Design a binder for this molecule. Structure first.
Ligand code: HEM
Length: 151
């Protein structure tokens, strides 16, 4: 459970992310795909992309990055009271997209890295720790739904 102070650190940096949702989403998905190429293979939509320049040039990838970060922002703003948000996300990611929990760890790492690059003044160690806790809570709660469903 995050404290109120931890949530404030999380949402303070998140408010900065929302100034450029699409650029963050691009940076995060590209980092994910480059650092963990098995993740790109899960996207029939994107697996034709073979270089970072091609990824950066894809408007469709930029659009999907907005989709991802909009869903995550809605979750974070619930401050842990996110059952209604995680139900459909866990269902689609477990049963349709077939995404291991480990790949959610990978995207969490990419998120933290990009937030640190773009917002150092609002993403010192205290905020890094708080965002790590928020993304761990996300993963814990998704994992419980995966377990229910046999994934
Ligand atoms: C912060 C973590 C993530 C969030 C918030 C998120 C959110 C979303 C959302 C909102 C959608 C569209 C609706 C849906 O299908 O449920 C989506 C689609 C999808 N996601 Fe994620 N996602 C996350 C992590 C991942 C990861 C790590 C992968 C793969 C490694 C992945 C693979 C997919 C795929 C394959 C689709 C379908 C794309 C398409 O063909 O349109 N997601 N995601």
């Amino acid at each position: 459970v995050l404290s109120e102070g931890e949530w404030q650190l999380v949402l303070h940096v998140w408010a900065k992310v929302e100034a450029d949702v699409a650029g963050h989403g691009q940076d995060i998905l590209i980092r994910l795909f480059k650092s963990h190429p098995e993740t790109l293979e899960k996207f029939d939509r994107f697996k034709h992309l073979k270089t970072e320049a091609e990824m950066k040039a894809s408007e469709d990838l930029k659009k999907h990055g907005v989709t991802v970060l909009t869903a995550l922002g809605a979750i974070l703003k619930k401050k842990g009271h996110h059952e209604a948000e995680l139900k459909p996300l866990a269902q689609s990611h477990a049963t349709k997209h077939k995404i291991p929990i480990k790949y959610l760890e990978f995207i969490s790492e990419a998120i933290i890295h990009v937030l640190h690059s773009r917002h150092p003044g609002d993403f010192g160690a205290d905020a890094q720790g708080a965002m790590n806790k928020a993304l761990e809570l996300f993963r814990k709660d998704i994992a419980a739904k995966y377990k229910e469903l046999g994934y």
